[PDB]
């Protein structure tokens, strides 16, 4: 892919974070803490899952960013509507306003309804996310494997401003404590 030149500087929005997340001072890294992180509750915070949004909102144009997932066992990445549900249980699907992929139990899947099996020969350590608002496209790229395509959602019906979306995953196993990191341009 030659999408690198639409690169955007993403930062995480603390106010949207699940109360157990720890976001770095530069707002470029997030990990699961071992307890509640001593913040007040608010209507923006994802309550049920270790999720957080980017601060940036996109309503036009082409955008690209990269995320480091080194040595994680579980995570979700992509974009979502600004108005997605924050409280209670929900599925990651385009019907619910999410365009995402994930790693879970040693397999990669795209968040369609129902979910789609991905075919990745080289487990990624960094993921590239490309959004073309006008075209209705969200694409994912394997930066570890020379930028190879992972998945494209096309005919997307965004129906609102988009925000970068992150889930660091639970750490029931003790093997998923590592952070998500936004990679430099």
Ligand X SMILES: CN1CCCc2ccc(S(N)(=O)=O)cc21
Provide φ and ψ at 32, rounded to 5°.
-75, 125
**Span interacting with ligand X, options 80-88, 153-161, 164-172, 177-185, rule CB under 6 A:** 164-172
Q: Decide: residue 87, CB within 10 A, 0-12 exposed, 13-18 middle, 19+ buried.
A: exposed
50 makes contact with ligand X (CB under 6 A): yes
| Distant-in-sequence, close-in-space partners of 165: CB < 8 Å, separation ≥ 6 | 51, 53, 54, 76, 77, 78, 79, 80, 98, 100
Measure CA 81 to chain center.
Answer: 12
Tell me which residue has its CB nearest to ligand X. Answer: 104
Q: For residues 91 and 152, which CB has a smaller minimum distance to ligand X in the complex?
A: 91
In angstroms, what is the minimal distance from the CB of 157 to ligand X? 18
List the one residue from 32, 74, 127, 162 that touches ligand X (CB under 6 A): 74
By the rule CB under 6 A, 53 interacts with ligand X: no
Q: Counting contacts by CB under 6 A, is residue 76 touching ligand X?
A: yes
């Amino acid at each position: 892919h030659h999408h690198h030149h639409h690169m955007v500087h993403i930062t995480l929005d603390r106010n949207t974070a699940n109360s157990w997340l720890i976001i770095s001072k530069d707002r470029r890294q997030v990990r699961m803490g071992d307890t509640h992180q001593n913040v007040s509750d608010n209507k923006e915070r994802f309550s049920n899952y270790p999720m957080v949004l980017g601060a940036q909102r996109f309503s036009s144009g082409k955008m690209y960013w990269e995320v480091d997932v080194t040595q994680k066992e579980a995570w979700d990445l992509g974009v979502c509507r600004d108005s997605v549900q924050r409280k209670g249980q929900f599925s990651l699907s385009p019907e619910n306003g999410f365009w995402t992929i994930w790693l879970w139990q040693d397999s990669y899947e795209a968040g369609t309804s129902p979910q789609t099996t991905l075919h990745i020969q080289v487990p990624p350590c960094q993921i590239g996310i490309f959004v073309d608002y006008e075209a209705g496209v969200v694409s994912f790229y394997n930066i570890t494997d020379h930028g190879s395509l992972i998945y494209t959602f096309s005919e997307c019906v965004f129906a609102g401003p988009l925000r970068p979306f992150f889930n660091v995953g639970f750490n029931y196993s003790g093997g998923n404590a590592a952070p998500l990191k936004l990679c430099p341009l």
